[PDB]
């Protein structure tokens, strides 16, 4: 190709104006095969310039000068200057050196992590460049490990500046797009490390129904299999493939009962101890792999081995799938060691994700992160987080930052996994985040005390958790449409603020704030409430524009950074003027696609929303106060329209237009009501409540209302009253 240049023992491939592959080969042969990371090097032709001399070469694109002075790659022989001025002297890449600016990516797991842990670099940098080293093995055409690359150094130089979304799109072109999730993945999951019986598990599922909590997935953790019943001469019961018959005397009947309740079923698989001689599938595996059964030779875990993988999928997973298991929870914690040098977690995720496609369309796994490109094998499973405010306070940042290495379907244990401390408010705040996260999977440790059941908690916490869990199912249309946009267009559901606002310094200073799809901006509260206010808080950056609280309609004039206060039952979620958000009107109703959609419209600007579905596309347009709904294909679906406050149209069938110009634009939210509520719940002196209510009611000029609150001895009460005055300005 014209986009390929060889010089000395190096090869340079200009894939885009902003993406260059850099290779070294001692043998003069360069690698064309796919790798664990890279699935596609076919990119459209681009323009660039070369200065080639006897001893040096310079490649020049719109954004980078790449220099190579010959010989082995060193920090002196191979380096690049970006054509940007984001920094004063951090604009140069040197081979093998780190530079400042990397916005980070993700890491394997949150196992044993209490609050923050270090992350790996991503492809995004504030200074406009990043290098992604390909250190993986080569694949065969069908996707088996083929061995070592002939490109003994193989690098990707990203020089996208702050065009983060295009960097991610081209990353997906190189490493392959995320597959589409199935709709069931986007609902509530129930999970608990608890030794349920068939009877007590179904009783709990029927209790969820009675309690008005919708579920899409039934996880069965490791007590599904033999544990204490495993003879100690075999080792532990951690790995198992044999039903505990006391708890599950008829597995297929139990899974049929979950299927009748419209639940998808997954089992915990700890693969590391393989198939030992006590297991129900051992006789078939032993025959297939020619094991010495009289010496009880184990089929040790070996995912490098084709015969082992075949026996694992066909003779170990196969019978369980025949009993009705829908997909696999791969729960690997036993290290990165294999004869091939390929991480066993990568081999599991790559091969299990492929195998899952045989029994179901668009199937998933649930497994830990296995390095760049492992977004091809959703879903991510972050694992055994410590239950703490610190862990919750890290998790939104962790989740949005992961989009910087394209790993956009993290499923966290909602409420935290293990250890840590009880606080029903922490559980409630964690569920609020989970509902506005990629995946909402409730899960917990082997403790008698860590159940995430809403009715574990008092009546106030229970009702709020049920409300948020119902909200998750109202959001499934929005989530599923965003899912198809991840798969087809390479856009993350969860974006850091700096994707949309790359030149705003405040977009780098609100770590836990994120865009959730294209219509909603989320600022979860991740700190214990101030008991004097009976409210939690978070500093929100409002971009330019008019913003509304998604729930209350409280308005905010951007651009501003403003501390916002919410009771423990309320979450800061915001929509711009013109936002249109579809909601399922019947989130409890078991139906493959919603029979009724609520179109929730935020007044004050034009907008539009495209609802992508399995078998349809529905466009909602809001232009000069006219709201129109059209679909590719006709259906019996009934549309409800909510314009700000008021339901305008109920259950209208087919395509239509309606003029909202003559309809009430304003939400109910008002300063006086909100003020009374904040003063009333506050654990402060009644004389202070009386004086604040009286003075803020009497003083007419906004600047003097602000001067009055500025004299308050309670600094946080000042900030709370200021938020109300700012919204009421």
Ligand X SMILES: OC[C@H]1O[C@H](O[C@@H]2[C@@H](O)[C@H](O)[C@@H](CO)O[C@@H]2O)[C@H](O)[C@@H](O)[C@@H]1O
Q: Which of the ranges 258-266, 441-449, 582-590, 667-675 carries the binding residues for ligand X, by CB under 6 A?
A: 441-449
Our measurement of the distance from residue 527's CA atom to the centroid of its chain's CA atoms, rounded to an integer in Å, reads 21
In whole angstroms, the minimum distance from the beta carbon of 368 to a second copy comes to: 14
Of the two residues 287 and 650, which places its CB atom closer to a second copy in the complex? Answer: 287
Q: Does 660 bind ligand X (CB under 6 A)?
A: no
Q: Other CB atoms closer than 10 Å to residue 421's CB: what's the count?
A: 10
In whole angstroms, the minimum distance from the beta carbon of 329 to a second copy comes to: 16
Footprint (CB under 6 A) of ligand X, residues 315-334:
331, 333
Q: Which entry of ligand X, a second copy, none binds 331, CB below 5 to 8 A by partner kind?
A: ligand X
Kindly determine how many residues on this chain lie close enough to bind a second copy according to the rule CB under 8 A: 44
Q: Which entry of ligand X, a second copy, none binds 272, CB below 5 to 8 A by partner kind?
A: a second copy
Q: Which entry of a second copy, ligand X, none binds 445, CB below 5 to 8 A by partner kind?
A: ligand X
In the list 17, 81, 111, 280, the residue contacting ligand X (rule: CB under 6 A) is: 111
Of the two residues 445 and 705, which places its CB atom closer to ligand X in the complex? Answer: 445
In whole angstroms, the minimum distance from the beta carbon of 219 to a second copy comes to: 19
Q: Does 27 bind a second copy (CB under 8 A)?
A: no
Contacts of 141 (CB under 8 A, 6+ apart): none
Of the two residues 334 and 640, which places its CB atom closer to a second copy in the complex? Answer: 334
Q: Does 415 bind ligand X (CB under 6 A)?
A: no
Q: Does 519 bind ligand X (CB under 6 A)?
A: no
Task: List 607's β-bridge partners, or say none.
Answer: 622
Q: Does 384 bind ligand X (CB under 6 A)?
A: yes
Which three-class secondary structure string do you get for 232-276?
Answer: HHHCCCCCCCCECCCCCCCHHHHHHHHHHCCCEEEEEECCCCCEC
Q: Which entry of a second copy, ligand X, none binds 518, CB below 5 to 8 A by partner kind?
A: none
Give the residue carrying structure tokens 């799109």.
169
In whole angstroms, the minimum distance from the beta carbon of 383 to ligand X comes to: 4
> What backbone torsions phi and psi does residue 418 show, to the nearest 5 degrees?
-145, 170
Question: Are the beta carbons of 299 and 291 closer than 8 angstroms?
Answer: yes
Q: Which entry of ligand X, a second copy, none binds 268, CB below 5 to 8 A by partner kind?
A: ligand X
In whole angstroms, the minimum distance from the beta carbon of 272 to ligand X comes to: 12
Contacts of 558 (CB under 8 A, 6+ apart): 542, 543, 544, 545, 546, 547
Query: What secondary structure does DSSP assign to 145-190, as a single string?
Result: EEE--S-SEEEEEE--TT-HHHHHHHHHHHH-PPPPPPGGGGSEEE
DSSP run (H or E) holding 559: none
In the list 163, 297, 500, 608, the residue contacting a second copy (rule: CB under 8 A) is: 297
Q: Which entry of a second copy, ligand X, none binds 111, CB below 5 to 8 A by partner kind?
A: ligand X
DSSP run (H or E) holding 2: none
Question: Are the beta carbons of 277 and 298 closer than 8 angstroms?
Answer: yes
Of the two residues 219 and 692, which places its CB atom closer to ligand X in the complex? Answer: 219
Q: Which of the ranges 39-47, 64-72, 131-139, 181-189 carries the binding residues for a second copy, by CB under 8 A?
A: 64-72
DSSP run (H or E) holding 461: helix 459-474
In the list 335, 357, 681, 729, the residue contacting a second copy (rule: CB under 8 A) is: 335
Of the two residues 113 and 611, which places its CB atom closer to a second copy in the complex? Answer: 113
Q: Which entry of ligand X, a second copy, none binds 193, CB below 5 to 8 A by partner kind?
A: ligand X
Max CA separation in the chain (angstroms): 92
Kindly determine how many residues on this chain lie close enough to bind ligand X according to the rule CB under 6 A: 15
In whole angstroms, the minimum distance from the beta carbon of 635 to a second copy comes to: 51
Q: Which entry of ligand X, a second copy, none binds 237, CB below 5 to 8 A by partner kind?
A: a second copy
Length, in residues, of the chain: 729
In the list 125, 391, 401, 445, the residue contacting ligand X (rule: CB under 6 A) is: 445
Q: Which of the ranges 57-65, 148-156, 455-463, 546-554 carries the binding residues for a second copy, by CB under 8 A?
A: 57-65
Identify the sign of the CA torsion 713, 716, 719, 724: negative
Identify the sign of the CA torsion 94, 98, 102, 105: positive
The two three-digit tokens of residue 118, written as one number: 């270090």
Q: Which of the ranges 182-190, 439-447, 492-500, 671-679 carries the binding residues for ligand X, by CB under 6 A?
A: 439-447
Binding pattern to a second copy, positions 191-230, x when CB under 8 A? Answer: ---------------------------------------x
Question: Are the beta carbons of 180 and 362 closer than 8 angstroms?
Answer: yes
Q: Which entry of a second copy, ligand X, none binds 233, CB below 5 to 8 A by partner kind?
A: a second copy
Gap between the terminal Cα atoms of the chain = 62
Footprint (CB under 8 A) of a second copy, residues 66-85:
67, 69, 75-77, 81-85
Tell me how far apart the alpha carbons of residues 692 and 359 are, in angstroms, rounded to a whole number.
Answer: 65
Tell me how far apart the alpha carbons of residues 627 and 657 are, in angstroms, rounded to a whole number.
Answer: 6
The two three-digit tokens of residue 317, written as one number: 């997973």
Alpha carbon dihedral 24, 29, 35, 40, in 10-degree steps, equals 100
The two three-digit tokens of residue 75, written as one number: 């920090």
In whole angstroms, the minimum distance from the beta carbon of 193 to ligand X comes to: 4
Give the residue carrying structure tokens 């862990």.
391
Question: Are the beta carbons of 214 and 207 closer than 8 angstroms?
Answer: no
- Breaks in the chain listed by the residue before each, with C–N > 2.5 Å: none
Q: Which 3 state secondary structure label does DSSP give 60?
A: strand
Q: Does 268 bind ligand X (CB under 6 A)?
A: yes
Question: Are the beta carbons of 581 and 609 closer than 8 angstroms?
Answer: yes
Of the two residues 92 and 456, which places its CB atom closer to a second copy in the complex? Answer: 92
Of the two residues 77 and 354, which places its CB atom closer to a second copy in the complex? Answer: 77
In whole angstroms, the minimum distance from the beta carbon of 367 to ligand X comes to: 11
Footprint (CB under 6 A) of ligand X, residues 155-194:
193
Tell me how far apart the alpha carbons of residues 411 and 43 are, in angstroms, rounded to a whole number.
Answer: 32
Of the two residues 292 and 673, which places its CB atom closer to a second copy in the complex? Answer: 292
Of the two residues 83 and 360, which places its CB atom closer to a second copy in the complex? Answer: 83
Give the residue carrying structure tokens 């003020």.
675
Of the two residues 19 and 82, which places its CB atom closer to ligand X in the complex? Answer: 82
Tell me how far apart the alpha carbons of residues 156 and 274 are, in angstroms, rounded to a whole number.
Answer: 37
In whole angstroms, the minimum distance from the beta carbon of 337 to a second copy comes to: 5
Cis peptide before 239 (omega within 30 of 0): no
Give contact residues for a second copy (rule: CB under 8 A).
49, 51, 58, 60, 65, 67, 69, 75-77, 81-85, 87-89, 91-92, 94, 97, 230, 232-238, 270, 272-273, 292, 295, 297-298, 300, 333-335, 337-339
Give contact residues for ligand X (rule: CB under 6 A).
88, 111, 193, 221-222, 268, 331, 333, 383-384, 417-418, 443, 445-446
């Amino acid at each position: 190709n014209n986009n390929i240049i060889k010089f000395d023992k190096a090869r340079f491939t200009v894939l885009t104006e902003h993406l260059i592959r850099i290779e070294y080969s001692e043998t003069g042969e360069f690698e064309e095969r796919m790798t664990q990371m890279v699935q596609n090097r076919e990119f459209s032709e681009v323009n660039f310039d070369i200065i080639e001399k006897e001893e040096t070469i310079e490649i020049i694109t719109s954004t980078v000068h790449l220099y190579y002075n010959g010989g082995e790659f060193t920090n002196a022989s191979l380096f690049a200057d970006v054509k940007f001025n984001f920094s004063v002297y951090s604009n140069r890449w040197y081979f093998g050196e780190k530079s400042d600016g990397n916005l980070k990516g993700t890491t394997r797991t949150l196992d044993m992590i209490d609050g923050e842990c270090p992350l790996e670099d991503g492809i995004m940098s504030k200074n406009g460049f990043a290098v992604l080293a390909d250190k993986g093995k080569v694949l065969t055409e069908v996707g088996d490990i083929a061995g070592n690359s002939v490109s003994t150094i193989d690098l990707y130089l990203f020089a996208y500046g702050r065009d983060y979304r295009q960097a991610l799109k081209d990353f997906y072109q190189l490493t392959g797009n995320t597959p589409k999730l199935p709709r069931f993945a986007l609902g509530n999951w129930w999970s608990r490390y608890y030794d349920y019986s068939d009877k007590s598990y179904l009783a709990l599922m029927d209790k969820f129904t009675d309690k008005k909590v919708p579920l899409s997935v039934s996880v069965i953790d490791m007590d599904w299999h033999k544990v204490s019943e495993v003879p100690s001469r075999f080792g532990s019961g951690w790995t198992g493939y044999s039903w505990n018959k006391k708890l599950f005397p008829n597995p297929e009947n139990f899974i049929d009962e979950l299927h009748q309740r419209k639940l998808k079923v997954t089992l915990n698989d700890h693969p590391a101890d393989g198939i030992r001689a006590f297991e129900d599938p051992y006789p078939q595996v032993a025959q297939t792999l020619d094991l010495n059964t009289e010496l009880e030779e184990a089929a040790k875990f070996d995912f490098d081995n084709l015969k082992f993988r075949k026996a694992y999928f066909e003779e170990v997973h196969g019978p369980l799938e025949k009993e009705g298991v829908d997909f696999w929870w791969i729960d690997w914690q036993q290290g990165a060691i294999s004869k091939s040098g390929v991480d066993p977690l990568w081999l599991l995720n790559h091969y299990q994700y492929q195998n899952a496609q045989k029994k179901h369309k668009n199937n998933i796994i649930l497994s830990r992160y296995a390095g760049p490109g492992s977004h091809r094998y959703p879903l991510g499973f972050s694992g055994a987080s410590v239950i703490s405010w610190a862990s919750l306070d890290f998790q939104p940042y962790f989740t949005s930052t992961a989009s910087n290495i394209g790993y956009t379907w993290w499923s966290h244990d909602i409420g935290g996994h293990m250890q840590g401390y009880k606080d029903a408010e922490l559980s409630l705040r964690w569920l609020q985040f989970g509902v506005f996260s990629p995946i909402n999977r409730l899960h917990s440790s082997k403790s008698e005390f860590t159940s995430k059941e809403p009715w574990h908690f008092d009546a106030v916490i229970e009702q709020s958790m049920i409300d948020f869990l119902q909200l998750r199912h109202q959001l499934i249309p929005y989530l599923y449409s965003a899912n198809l946009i991840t798969a087809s267009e390479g856009r993350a559901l969860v974006e850091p603020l700096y994707y949309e606002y790359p030149m705003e310094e405040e977009a780098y200073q609100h770590r836990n704030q994120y865009l959730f799809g294209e219509q909603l901006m989320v600022a979860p509260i991740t700190e214990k409430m101030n008991s004097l206010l009976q409210m939690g808080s978070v500093e929100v950056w409002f971009p330019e524009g008019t913003w509304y609280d998604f729930f209350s309609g409280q308005p905010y004039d951007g651009k501003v950074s403003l501390k916002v206060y919410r009771e423990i039952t309320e979450m800061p979620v915001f929509a711009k003027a013109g936002a249109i958000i579809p909601l399922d009107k019947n989130p409890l109703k078991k139906e493959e696609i919603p029979s009724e959609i609520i179109w929730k419209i935020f007044p004050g600007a034009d907008g539009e929303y495209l609802l992508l579905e399995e078998d349809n596309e529905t466009k909602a347009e809001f232009v000069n106060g006219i709201f129109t709904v059209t679909s590719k294909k006709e259906s019996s679906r009934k549309h409800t329209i909510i314009y700000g406050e008021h339901e305008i149209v109920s259950a209208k069938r087919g395509e239509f237009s309606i003029d909202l110009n003559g309809k009430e634009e304003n939400f109910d939210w008002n300063f006086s009501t909100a003020l009374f509520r904040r003063l009333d719940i506050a654990e402060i002196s009644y004389e202070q409540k009386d004086e604040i209510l009286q003075q803020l009611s009497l003083i007419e000029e906004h600047e003097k209302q602000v001067a009055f609150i500025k004299t308050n001895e309670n600094q946080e009460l000042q900030n709370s009253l200021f938020e109300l005055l700012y919204s009421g300005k």
